[PDB]
Amino acid sequence: KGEELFTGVVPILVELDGDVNGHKFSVSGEGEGDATYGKLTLKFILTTGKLPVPWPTLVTTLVQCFSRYPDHMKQHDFFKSAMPEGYVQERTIFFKDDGNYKTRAEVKFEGDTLVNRIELKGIDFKEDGNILGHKLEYNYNCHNVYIMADKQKNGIKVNFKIRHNIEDGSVQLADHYQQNTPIGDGPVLLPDNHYLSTQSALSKDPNEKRDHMVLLEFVTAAGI
């Protein structure tokens, strides 16, 4: 199974090509994933352009194959079963009373490295609002991610709402609609309904002068 590719520490590359209200930018991520512990450690760097949106809004876009699936749930792990050929992850993200992200990503092995290659298009963003006005706190809450099989589309569908804390004491809602489809023709596990409990901690590198985000995550499958 693809599950064998994840028993140890896997190096990760993330590449994001972004356009938000016509402002162009690229981000590169490097680090590693230890699926045995559901653990991700990544450093993301703005490499092209100026960052037109808050780092926290990009977290969900910037590799659910690193989730810890308890042994009694291993037959429900779509993400690893798609590997090594990988899957396509497509989302729409609706920022309440503001703009929307459309993302398309390919997540696959390029050699022994797990690569997340993302295209992101944002539009309809208000110049003064929580996103273009950089008003979101540099922090992240624990979230559950609800996974359902879509047998007719040979994949999974995933729904969840992110609550981004704002400095002014309100919350910016980010409504996520996600689909994952295998790239390969080989058989993939279609799961029963379950969720991923995702804890995310954002930090900074004190020696890094470029705009960046350091991320530590723990993700654990549950509900079967």
Measured CA to CA, the distance from residue 153 to residue 174 in angstroms comes to 25
- Any residues with CB less than 8 A from the CB of 14 and at least 6 apart, and which? 27, 28, 29, 30, 42, 44, 62, 63, 115, 116, 118
Say if residues 165 and 194 touch (Cβ distance below 8 Å). Answer: no
CA 68 to chain centre: 15
149-160: buried (b, 16+ CB within 10 Å) or exposed (e) per residue? Answer: beeeeebbebeb
Note the resolution in Å, 1 decimal.
Answer: 1.9
Say if residues 38 and 67 touch (Cβ distance below 8 Å). Answer: yes
CATH superfamily of 2-222: Green fluorescent protein (2.40.155.10)
**Residue 162: HSE in the Cβ half-sphere, 13 Å Cα cutoff:** 25
